[PDB]
Amino acid sequence: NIDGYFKIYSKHTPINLVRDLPQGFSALEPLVDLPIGINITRFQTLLA
Amino acid sequence: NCYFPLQSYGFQPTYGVGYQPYRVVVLSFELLHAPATVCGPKKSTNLV
Numbered sequence: 215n216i217d218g219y220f221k222i223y224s225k226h227t228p229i230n231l232v233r234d235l236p237q238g239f240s241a242l243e244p245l246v247d248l249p250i251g252i253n254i255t256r257f258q259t260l261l262a
Numbered sequence: 263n264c265y266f267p268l269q270s271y272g273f274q275p276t277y278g279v280g281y282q283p284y285r286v287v288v289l290s291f292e293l294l295h296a297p298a299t300v301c302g303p304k305k306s307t308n309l310v
């Protein structure tokens with residue numbers, strides 16, 4: 215959140231690994247940006 | 263001296279130009295405390 219602009223950058227990349235966050239290099243492209251204006255201080259995900 | 267507060271208007275296409283009904287829009291906006299999420303249209307001209 216930057217002055218009420220809330221921004222997302224992201225990636226899906228394929229891998230093949232058993233355990234840990236893979237070592238390596240890839241960047242996240244910008245996906246979306248929403249002028250939500252609010253004061254996020256904390257957050258939670260959503261499982262299904 | 264108890265009175266019900268409302269008084270529904272009476273409409274007749276016969277009425278005087280004043281007692282006739284008139285629709286209103288007030289384009290209200292509250293200004294300049296947050297990120298802008300409206301603008302007027304941005305013109306364009308053909309490419310040389």
Ligand SMILES: *[C@@H]1O[C@H](CO)[C@@H](O)[C@H](O)[C@H]1NC(C)=O
Nearest residue numbers: 218250251252253254295296
């Ligand atoms: C966001 O938080 C700051 C610090 O508390 C405050 O100045 C600002 O007015 C808040 N804005 C909103 C939309 O609550």
